[PDB]
Scaffold this active site. Sequence first.
Site, PDB file in Angstrom:
ATOM      1  CG  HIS A  49      -1.583  -1.351   1.441  1.00 14.36           C
ATOM      2  ND1 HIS A  49      -2.567  -1.811   0.628  1.00 14.36           N
ATOM      3  CD2 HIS A  49      -1.370  -2.342   2.412  1.00 14.36           C
ATOM      4  CE1 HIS A  49      -2.968  -3.025   1.053  1.00 14.36           C
ATOM      5  NE2 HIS A  49      -2.245  -3.339   2.161  1.00 14.36           N
ATOM      6  CG  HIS A 101       3.336   5.640   5.239  1.00 15.74           C
ATOM      7  ND1 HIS A 101       3.057   5.567   6.577  1.00 15.74           N
ATOM      8  CD2 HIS A 101       2.300   6.345   4.665  1.00 15.74           C
ATOM      9  CE1 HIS A 101       1.893   6.221   6.834  1.00 15.74           C
ATOM     10  NE2 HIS A 101       1.380   6.627   5.644  1.00 15.74           N
ATOM     11  CG  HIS A 149      -0.263   8.529   1.421  1.00 15.88           C
ATOM     12  ND1 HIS A 149      -1.037   7.406   1.437  1.00 15.88           N
ATOM     13  CD2 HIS A 149       0.198   8.700   2.716  1.00 15.88           C
ATOM     14  CE1 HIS A 149      -1.152   6.932   2.696  1.00 15.88           C
ATOM     15  NE2 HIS A 149      -0.398   7.677   3.469  1.00 15.88           N
ATOM     16  CD  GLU A 205      -3.407   9.814   2.340  1.00 16.38           C
ATOM     17  OE1 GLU A 205      -3.070   9.820   3.517  1.00 16.38           O
ATOM     18  OE2 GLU A 205      -3.939   8.822   1.803  1.00 16.38           O
ATOM     19  CG  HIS A 230       1.270  10.402   6.138  1.00 16.76           C
ATOM     20  ND1 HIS A 230       0.151   9.795   5.727  1.00 16.76           N
ATOM     21  CD2 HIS A 230       1.095  11.784   5.853  1.00 16.76           C
ATOM     22  CE1 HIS A 230      -0.698  10.743   5.189  1.00 16.76           C
ATOM     23  NE2 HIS A 230      -0.112  11.913   5.284  1.00 16.76           N
ATOM     24  CB  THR A 251      -5.043   8.311   5.457  1.00 17.36           C
ATOM     25  OG1 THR A 251      -3.720   7.889   5.123  1.00 17.36           O
ATOM     26  CG2 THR A 251      -5.102   9.662   6.232  1.00 17.36           C
TER      27      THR A 251
HETATM   28  C1  LIG Z   1      -2.621   0.347  13.430  1.00 24.79           C
HETATM   29  C2  LIG Z   1      -2.001   0.569  12.054  1.00 24.79           C
HETATM   30  C3  LIG Z   1      -1.052   1.761  12.024  1.00 24.79           C
HETATM   31  S1  LIG Z   1       0.243   1.587  10.742  1.00 24.79           S
HETATM   32  C4  LIG Z   1      -0.112   3.134   9.898  1.00 24.79           C
HETATM   33  C5  LIG Z   1      -0.287   4.266  10.680  1.00 24.79           C
HETATM   34  F1  LIG Z   1      -0.200   4.163  12.022  1.00 24.79           F
HETATM   35  C6  LIG Z   1      -0.578   5.502  10.099  1.00 24.79           C
HETATM   36  F2  LIG Z   1      -0.772   6.598  10.865  1.00 24.79           F
HETATM   37  C7  LIG Z   1      -0.669   5.656   8.719  1.00 24.79           C
HETATM   38  S2  LIG Z   1      -1.037   7.347   8.169  1.00 24.79           S
HETATM   39  N1  LIG Z   1      -1.222   7.510   6.422  1.00 24.79           N
HETATM   40  O1  LIG Z   1      -2.403   7.638   8.746  1.00 24.79           O
HETATM   41  O2  LIG Z   1      -0.019   8.364   8.702  1.00 24.79           O
HETATM   42  C8  LIG Z   1      -0.479   4.519   7.906  1.00 24.79           C
HETATM   43  F3  LIG Z   1      -0.575   4.617   6.544  1.00 24.79           F
HETATM   44  C9  LIG Z   1      -0.193   3.262   8.490  1.00 24.79           C
HETATM   45  F4  LIG Z   1       0.015   2.157   7.691  1.00 24.79           F
END
Ligand SMILES: CCCSc1c(F)c(F)c(S(N)(=O)=O)c(F)c1F
Length: 258
Positions: A61, A91, A93, A103, A116, A196
């Site tokens: 993802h 990570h 987007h 986003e 993020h 998200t």
């Molecule tokens: C319990 C699962 C949390 S892993 C995770 C995450 F914490 C995020 F904030 C995000 S994000 N895009 O909200 O910062 C995310 F993509 C994730 F894969």
Amino acid sequence: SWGYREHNGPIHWKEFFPIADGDQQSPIEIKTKEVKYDSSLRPLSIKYDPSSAKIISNSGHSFNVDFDDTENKSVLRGGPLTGSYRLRQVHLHWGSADDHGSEHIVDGVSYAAELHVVHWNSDKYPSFVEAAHEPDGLAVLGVFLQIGEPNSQLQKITDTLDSIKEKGKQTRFTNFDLLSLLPPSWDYWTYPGSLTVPPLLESVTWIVLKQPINISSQQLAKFRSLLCTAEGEAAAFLVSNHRPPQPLKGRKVRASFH
Ligand SMILES: CCCSc1c(F)c(F)c(S(N)(=O)=O)c(F)c1F
């Protein structure tokens, strides 16, 4: 399973995660004229140890850079936060065009991508997993990317991408100076929201930096070559992995700056 294709993408997430239609969902439209300046907000207090990053992986993802979160070597404090939030994850987007990948959207402007940085409240919770289920559990720092000069730290990440093309693949990755990657200004907006991606938990204090950092179009396009499919399964590419903005539903978006 959930994804960003026609059959499994964001408009369909509510089919499996009903909180998708809750009242504190992210991301949002940031309308600068509607944000409240709040002088009680503090500057960000940022400590990122470049040796904390350990592994980069394709989740299917996004890519995730995973940090050793054994103790408090890398922590975010200040901003709107009470207590210390430990670095867990970074990570990215993006979208299929450089026009529209972020986003959060600022008065209608979508940036090319959005980074993020995920942290958890280790002052109140014993683990990331426990923190991810509580309203004050997580803090995510959002950093826009716009197309510009190639980014030497992001090149370290794009260099690994060939090796993690398939879903589930990982490779060692360390010495990532996250602190120096951030833009020169750390002025930010903040609001209460959610992850998200599924499970979409309403556990996140969002801190979205106003100032973008750059990436080249060539570097950004290497991300779209990740697969959202595991080795031995019909190949599909992760050309876009951003969720649309969600209704604000009476939440206050605050600015640390005026
Ligand atoms: C319990 C699962 C949390 S892993 C995770 C995450 F914490 C995020 F904030 C995000 S994000 N895009 O909200 O910062 C995310 F993509 C994730 F894969």
